[PDB]
Design an enzyme around this catalytic site. Structure first.
Site, PDB file in Angstrom:
ATOM      1  N   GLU A 164       0.871  -1.168   0.000  1.00 57.84           N
ATOM      2  CA  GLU A 164       0.000   0.000   0.000  1.00 57.84           C
ATOM      3  C   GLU A 164       0.908   1.218   0.000  1.00 57.84           C
ATOM      4  OE1 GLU A 164      -2.717   1.076   3.395  1.00 57.84           O
ATOM      5  OE2 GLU A 164      -2.155   3.004   2.515  1.00 57.84           O
TER       6      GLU A 164
ATOM      7  N   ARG B   7       1.363  10.142   0.968  1.00 54.69           N
ATOM      8  CA  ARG B   7       1.843  11.023   2.028  1.00 54.69           C
ATOM      9  C   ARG B   7       3.112  11.767   1.643  1.00 54.69           C
ATOM     10  NH1 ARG B   7       0.748   7.372   7.565  1.00 54.69           N
ATOM     11  NH2 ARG B   7      -1.246   6.500   6.847  1.00 54.69           N
TER      12      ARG B   7
ATOM     13  N   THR C   4      -4.028   6.969   1.365  1.00 55.22           N
ATOM     14  CA  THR C   4      -4.069   8.376   1.762  1.00 55.22           C
ATOM     15  C   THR C   4      -4.623   9.247   0.639  1.00 55.22           C
ATOM     16  OG1 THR C   4      -2.109   7.986   3.127  1.00 55.22           O
ATOM     17  CG2 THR C   4      -2.780  10.253   2.818  1.00 55.22           C
TER      18      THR C   4
ATOM     19  N   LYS D 150     -11.962  -0.694   6.310  1.00 56.00           N
ATOM     20  CA  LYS D 150     -10.720  -0.590   7.032  1.00 56.00           C
ATOM     21  C   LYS D 150     -11.017   0.165   8.329  1.00 56.00           C
ATOM     22  CE  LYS D 150      -6.492   2.079   7.078  1.00 56.00           C
ATOM     23  NZ  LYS D 150      -5.334   2.601   6.308  1.00 56.00           N
TER      24      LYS D 150
END
Lengths: 216, 216, 216
Positions: B47, B51, B75, B135
């Site tokens: 993943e 960021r 993100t 999640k």
């Protein structure tokens, strides 16, 4: 009909109930016996969840054969389910959380809705539409008694019905708070008891839960 | 294409992964070596978070040079970023939380989206649009294992991927729950290890994480 | 006027304040004396809540007679209240949680808004509209210091103002985090002190709170 009316109605239902049992019917033949056990123990307000197929049928049977009991529906996840339970005869609706739809569905419905919330933002979302009575879920994980007190500051004019994590060890702490209408749970509805038909155990447990609330 | 299809697809991706590493690329020259270290340790699903600037470039490099690995993006805070990663070649998208936009963006997208939630209301908001795989973030602070169990009651047909607070000390507790697909974390991606290029330490740590999951 | 401008403005206000006192005026004659006590102790930025009738009048009196102090309004639950405080003269607005309306109200307003959030989804909802400065409420119950750190990962470019559960025992822990602008609370505004007019006790307590912040 009026929002302020539903607030009062749902408030009346919760105060007379004191303890809201979250029921999940796994077998048809369990409706009445389960209902009579609770009722004898002093629990006359039931919350039948749509967590199983037998959800709707249960509300109907209970509304036609046990008219003396106040029966509401729970685990209503959408406007479609909300409409269903309303036709089935539910006297009030309960949800685990909120959405824009559901909140508007409760504004148009005839029967009152007790929406489930966890945070201040969620409270405000329903506050704007005229909701003043909420269900805290999950109670313990959301902050329990401390959370209820915190929310009392900015939202001093709303009452709560904590559910999730409420048991004999902490039930009085919650009921002591002035802004708590009642509590919900399933600690008197042990699964094994229902299967083996141990209705004496359930009846005894309900009586104990009601007897536990008498002082503060 | 179909919501029920994405639910299944994202479910397949998470079960084969077991452990979803949340990667943040600080240096370009770290893409491949980092990827090979994890891969050797048994972690083939990554993943890559947006960021950092190197987010998109990383997804591209990995999709062209390491086609054997399953790479998703994380993100993603808006529909704009969602569209970007999709073009970059991400095989699935992950978010820290949800919004009305993002949720609809995942309904129109070709690649599946695993939205991040914290409360029952948030779960319902995505449930309404057809989401069945979520999640939990932050896992620990949101209630950890107890929360997962609580949500299982009203939402018994959804699976979770807890992230945030998951480590070797509690990783099996989570994986024991029947409604947990996999877990996510960064405990095997120590910062110092990446800088000093201590890829043997990372490889060893990934192997340990995978070996930790084998019993229940 | 610009979103990025309000972000900076609200940031300036919070850094110079360090400690944001959440005031609730129960008596008119308490406005000034309370304000002078805090001010002498080093607290020049006040948050007057609309939790009581005297909310608006207080903001007005303070804005006309104590122009040297920076006064904002709190517990604004709707666009209607938001408009009121703005006319009363509030220099900034604070809320316990967020809604779609309120968030848009702060985009059109002239004075900055510090919205209160609890979860990542709520942060994103305001992030989309251009908010980069948030209030964490309730701080302790939401995860306190651990929560602030967790949110720093996906949202590394936002600062927080924790309120709720903040006291002398944990105030420095919060102020140590690089993404915390200031903290809020009512530990120096003891109720009994206000009634009995024990303003020396309040003044001494404010001084102690400010003196507590000087090292990290």
């Amino acid at each position: 009909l009026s929002m302020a009316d539903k607030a009062a109605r749902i408030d009346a239902i919760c105060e007379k109930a004191r303890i809201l049992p979250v029921i999940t019917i796994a077998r048809e033949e369990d409706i009445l016996p389960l209902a009579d056990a609770l009722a004898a123990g002093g629990i006359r307000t039931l919350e039948v969840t749509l967590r199983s197929q037998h959800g709707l049928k249960a509300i109907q049977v209970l509304r036609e054969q046990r008219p003396e009991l106040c029966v509401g529906a729970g685990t209503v996840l959408d406007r479609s389910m909300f409409a269903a339970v309303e036709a089935a005869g539910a006297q009030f609706v309960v949800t685990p959380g909120i959405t824009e739809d559901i909140l508007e569905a409760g504004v148009d419905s005839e029967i009152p809705l007790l929406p489930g919330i966890s945070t201040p933002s969620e409270i405000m979302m329903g506050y704007a539409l005229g909701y003043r009575r909420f269900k805290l879920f999950p109670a313990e994980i959301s902050g329990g008694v401390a959370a209820i007190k915190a929310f009392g500051g900015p939202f001093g004019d709303i009452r709560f019905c904590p559910t999730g994590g409420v048991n004999p060890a902490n039930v009085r702490n919650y009921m002591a708070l002035p802004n708590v209408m009642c509590v919900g749970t399933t600690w008197m509805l042990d699964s094994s008891w229902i299967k083996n038909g141990d209705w004496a155990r359930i009846e005894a447990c309900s009586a104990e839960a009601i007897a536990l609330l008498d002082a503060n």
